[PDB]
Write a structure and sequence with these properties.
This is part of a larger assembly, with chains A (about 180 residues), B (about 120 residues), C (about 50 residues), D (about 140 residues), E (about 80 residues) and F (about 70 residues). Chain A has a single domain (about 1-175), classed as Ribosomal protein L5 (50s Ribosomal Protein L5, Chain: A, 2-Layer Sandwich). Chain A contains 5 helices and 5 strands; from the N terminus they run ααβαββαββα. Chain A has helices at about 1-10, 10-15, 45-60, 95-105, 160-170; strands at about 30-35, 65-70, 85-90, 125-130, 150-155. The radius of gyration of chain A is 18 Å and the shape is globular. Chain B has about 120 residues and is an alpha+beta fold. Chain B has 4 helices and 4 strands, in the order ααβββαβα. Chain B has a 4-stranded mixed beta sheet. In chain B, α3 (about 65-80) runs parallel beside α4 (about 100-110). Chain B is globular and about 40 Å long. Chain E is mainly beta. Chain E has no helices and 7 strands. In chain E, β4 (about 45) and β5 form a beta hairpin. A 4-stranded antiparallel beta sheet of chain E has the order 1-2-5-4, with no helix packed on it. In chain E, strands 3-7-6 form a 3-stranded mixed beta sheet, with no helix packed on it. Classes of the chains: A alpha+beta (about 180), B alpha+beta (about 120), C mainly beta (about 50), D alpha+beta (about 140), E mainly beta (about 80), F alpha+beta (about 70). Chains in contact: A-F. The interface of A and F includes residues 57, 97, 105, 139 and 173 of A. Chain A binds 5 RNA strands through β1, β2, β3, β4 and β5.
RNA sequence: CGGUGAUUGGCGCAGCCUGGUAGCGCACUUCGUUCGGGACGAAGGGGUCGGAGGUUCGAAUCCUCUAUCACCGACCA
RNA sequence: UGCCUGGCGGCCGUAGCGCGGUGGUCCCACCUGACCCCAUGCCGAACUCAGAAGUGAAACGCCGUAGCGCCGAUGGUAGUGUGGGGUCUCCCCAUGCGAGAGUAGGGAACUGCCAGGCAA
RNA sequence: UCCUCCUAAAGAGUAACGGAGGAGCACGAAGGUUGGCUAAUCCUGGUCGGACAUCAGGAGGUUAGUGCAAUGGCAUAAGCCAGCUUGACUGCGAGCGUGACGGCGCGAGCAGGUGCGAAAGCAGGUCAUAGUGAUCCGGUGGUUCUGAAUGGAAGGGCCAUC
RNA sequence: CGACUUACCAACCCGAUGCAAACUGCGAAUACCGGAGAAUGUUAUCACGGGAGACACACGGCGGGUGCUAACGUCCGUC
RNA sequence: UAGUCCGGAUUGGAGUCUGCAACUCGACUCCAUGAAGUCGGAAUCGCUAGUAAUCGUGGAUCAGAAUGCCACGGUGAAUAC
């Protein structure tokens, strides 16, 4: 958590002059980082989900939870209560360490990288990015994996507008294509 | 919501408990100044009310809102409940899990002589 | 039709038994229920039989 | 023929036609065709009284149809005895109370609307009258 | 031709048996009903068929309580 | 956090070709050798070679020689 | 007038019973043999189950209404 | 005795939504750290523990605002018990009851017990 | 034969070859207790991924769910999840409802023995209403109740049951 | 691989308008249950015992299903 | 022993020659790219001696433009009961 203490008196102090806040609790704070992995093809192989659950054990810092199907559709042959994905909702102490490792030594590992999209906001201030490889994280030994499908990082903040949550990530230099 | 989710949580232990006409012990756990009171079965009046917000309790305690402060409330309730001739009560969790300060307030009442 | 009937015979000294039904072709395991025995006035574990 | 689309039930009861009407005030147009007698209008009678009325007010203008049948009527076939089930649905009637405005019209003079509602009133089994949109 | 209906059932004889202020001996069925149309109140029990049976030889009295206004059935004690 | 179900959280020391030694908490193992970091990456110089790429008049005058 | 049972490739049949796939004999397209056709070998293409409207996560399959395609009837005065 | 606040009730939209303003010495909430009591079908987000640096931001309480929701007259109309009548698939008369919808209007809740702060 | 709505005329009941649908099952968890939680359908963003799989946020409010066709009911949730268990127990049962009757249905409370919960308390099945047939005769086990002179036994009777 | 003109059909809310036995954010009059009271009625009320008959109904008003809001038609509830 | 340092199509950029001029519509070079293809169904072709098979060179045509045609050599079989 190097950039956790950097948040306390170089990011909150910066945001008090960009949107003229009157209280110290009016600053947008980040709440959680959720790592979905939409495997999808677990109807054919059950161990494909177990290899997908092993990738989040190295990319994140803890064990994933498999996600059952909410509804049931026939266009993809899934039933009610079938594991079709896996998620890691990391927050608290280990999220400042994961956000440190992501934007510094994992975003420049993206093949054919130009910059992150600055319009990927949900109208509230919650950013969501999507990567297409596992090899952007150094924890994978490149020989145990057999699937191109990566994951998607969702950063949930406590902002209200898209511009208000844009200035929160802008302190971490967050390359902004 | 945090407040209204606890009101519906305790309503099973409120509507059933007042159907029997039992003099209930309602606790209210708070991170500072935990409360507890004895309520008559009509629901509109109380009999015994004591907590750490009074100056007769918090002067003998270092911090109000931990386990040994909750033990001082449940002892002070049972010493005043026996003065009114009230022996048999029924404990009400009021939407709090019976693990920590709401257990030590209930353990200290069963040590002093409040039979429930 | 599918759910046939069985007989839970007491393992105690008496011959009192409860009757019930159990689907054999889906859950073929025997029952090990623990009901009250009115002869011994005990709570003896019952076992499945025919 | 004004016919409903996917009703909840195929066949309903006969029902009485007691009471008064609700559509009394002329709302959409300026001149209305208000009913006086108590009867009912089958689905062919609205469409037949529309052809003899729209042609007299030559197609410029606008005509509102304030009634819709949504009520099935059964009919037993010939040489069929009583009972043995309910008859088959043949046509659709609109229960007309006294005071119900049938048609409305706007965009025509008062003389053209007078000599056109009379052409539609001769197609209907009920006695109608000529009404005008009043203020308030 | 033929018909496909003509089937119904033994009317269940539901509704309220004992009305308003009308002394009922404990255990007396008051309301026999499908669901909890009428809810059990003071001194009145609810069965496994939502039959609110009396529990104290007294009167009856229906009410409306809470914030849902559910006729409620209590028992004045005389 | 729970026990016996989560992977190891041993602190390692990463290093890139720019000499930017930065310690992180991860699950790689013994050590980590990296290529680039958030600094010394062609993201602010990568767009420099993209704006002045297009153009055909200046391509023509190199074959005109005067 | 009803009642019983089907309407699936250009032809007509299995598949429905017991819901998760549309298949067979022909024909047609191309190549091969023959001077050339016919025949014969090889590769391949073509319907998405009459229509609507239920049931379920899902319908050719399960139910109801329809259209004309066959068979069975239609009493005794 | 007043203003506040917290817990427990009656009543349940005249009581609920929206907008604007305001509250922190009390109280309350956010928050702080979690090795430990406990616990996440992963995460201490929830629950639980030990404390009080900061804020009233989110939540909650209070006030104003009718922009909605809601209450609701008086009169009229429909309907109908009893006794008669008619151009009797419907309607009227005598008498008794009397809607629903709509209008004027009211309307930003009232109050009981106990504890704490403050002014008296 | 049974269950749900309407006809059925605001207590109950009420017919027709009247109008619409279902049942002759299932479950040892889909039951009991304790603890916690609130969806459907849309909108935006995001790797394969698209109208619809999984993740984040907003509106919305029970239009969702309740094993099963319908009605009534459900936020204290009867809906969902997890831990422990078998009260889906025996002998009763004041008091009513509904039937001409055979019958059917609810049931406070007592004794014994347990299950859950710290405790107050709940549990003698499933949110309720269909999932079913009387007797005779015969079979299985227990109980010396009787047992044709006496002592047994066979056969009868009672209980559980096919 | 991208799209310019757009006589036309048209989902949800918004304003207005009707309909429904299987729709009810509303809601009567009658009818039914229980309690108090004056008057009247040969106890007209209930239970038990002896004896039956009857269980083919018809019409008129009112609320209806059905038939064609046809029948001295048929099936219901009350008088 | 892998579609792999096999194979070279397709395609982008930069050029050389020829010709009055190379977009339709030439040949060649440099860099980059990497496809189908893993011995081929019915059926069918050529060959018994320097023959088949494999490799390169030269000429005509021609300003430039061949895998085609015409010729020249290097290695060099098997079988014909």
């Amino acid at each position: 958590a190097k950039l956790h203490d950097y948040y306390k008196d170089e990011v909150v102090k910066k945001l008090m002059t960009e949107f003229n806040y009157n209280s110290v609790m009016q600053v947008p704070r980040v709440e959680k980082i959720t790592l979905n992995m939409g495997v999808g093809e677990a109807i054919a192989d059950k161990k494909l989900l177990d290899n997908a659950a092993a990738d989040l054990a190295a990319i994140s810092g803890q064990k994933p939870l498999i996600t059952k199907a909410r509804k049931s559709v026939a266009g993809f042959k899934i039933r009610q209560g079938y594991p079709i994905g896996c998620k890691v909702t990391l927050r608290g102490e280990r999220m400042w360490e994961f956000f440190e490792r992501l934007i510094t030594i994992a975003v420049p590992r993206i093949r054919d990288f130009r910059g992150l999209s600055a319009k990927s906001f949900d109208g509230r201030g919650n950013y969501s990015m999507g990567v297409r490889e596992q090899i952007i994280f150094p924890e994978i030994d490149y020989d145990k994996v057999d699937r191109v499908r990566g994951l998607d990082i969702t950063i949930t903040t406590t902002a209200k507008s898209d511009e208000e949550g844009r200035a929160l990530l802008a302190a971490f230099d967050f390359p902004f294509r | 919501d945090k407040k209204s989710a606890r009101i519906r949580r305790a309503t099973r232990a409120r509507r059933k408990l007042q159907e029997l006409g039992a003099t209930r012990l309602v606790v209210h756990r708070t991170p500072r100044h935990i409360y507890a009171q004895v309520i008559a079965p009509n629901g509109s009046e109380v009999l015994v009310a004591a907590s750490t917000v009074e100056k007769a309790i918090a002067e003998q305690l270092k911090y109000t809102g931990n386990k040994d402060a909750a033990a001082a409330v449940g002892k002070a309730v049972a010493e005043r409940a026996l003065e009114k001739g009230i022996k048999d009560v029924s404990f009400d969790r009021s939407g709090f899990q019976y693990h920590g300060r709401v257990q030590a307030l209930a353990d200290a009442a069963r040590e002093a002589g409040l039979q429930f | 039709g599918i759910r046939e009937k069985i007989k839970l015979v007491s393992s105690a000294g008496t011959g009192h038994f409860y009757t019930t039904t159990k689907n054999k072709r889906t859950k073929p395991e025997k029952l090990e229920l623990k009901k009250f025995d009115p002869v011994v006035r005990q709570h003896v574990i019952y076992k499945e039989a025919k | 023929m004004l016919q409903p689309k996917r009703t909840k039930f195929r066949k309903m009861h006969k029902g009485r036609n007691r009471g008064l009407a609700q559509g009394t005030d002329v709302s959409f147009g300026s001149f209305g065709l208000k009913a006086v007698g108590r009867g009912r209008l089958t689905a062919r009678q609205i469409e037949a009284a529309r052809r003899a009325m729209t042609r007299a007010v030559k197609r410029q203008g606008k005509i509102w149809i304030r009634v819709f049948p949504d009520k099935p009527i059964t009919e037993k076939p010939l040489a069929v005895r009583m009972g043995k089930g309910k008859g088959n649905v043949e046509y659709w009637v609109a229960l007309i109370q006294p005071g119900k405005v049938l048609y409305e019209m706007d965009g025509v003079p008062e003389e053209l609307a007078r000599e056109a509602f009379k052409l539609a009133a001769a197609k209907l089994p009920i006695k109608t009258t000529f009404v005008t949109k009043t203020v308030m | 031709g033929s018909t496909r209906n003509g089937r119904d059932s033994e009317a269940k004889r539901l509704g309220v048996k004992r009305f308003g202020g009308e002394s009922v001996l404990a255990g007396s069925i008051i309301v026999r009903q499908r669901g909890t149309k009428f809810h059990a109140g003071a001194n009145v029990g609810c069965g496994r068929d939502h039959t609110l049976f009396a529990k104290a030889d007294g009167k009856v009295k229906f009410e409306v309580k809470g914030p849902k206004n559910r006729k409620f059935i209590s028992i004045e004690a005389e | 956090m729970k026990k016996d179900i989560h992977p190891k959280y041993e602190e390692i020391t990463a290093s890139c070709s720019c000499g930017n030694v930065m310690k992180i908490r991860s699950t790689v193992g013994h050590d980590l050798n990296l290529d680039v970091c958030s600094k010394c990456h062609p993201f602010f110089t990568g767009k420099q070679r993209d704006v002045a790429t297009g153009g055909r008049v200046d391509r023509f005058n190199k074959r005109f020689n005067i």
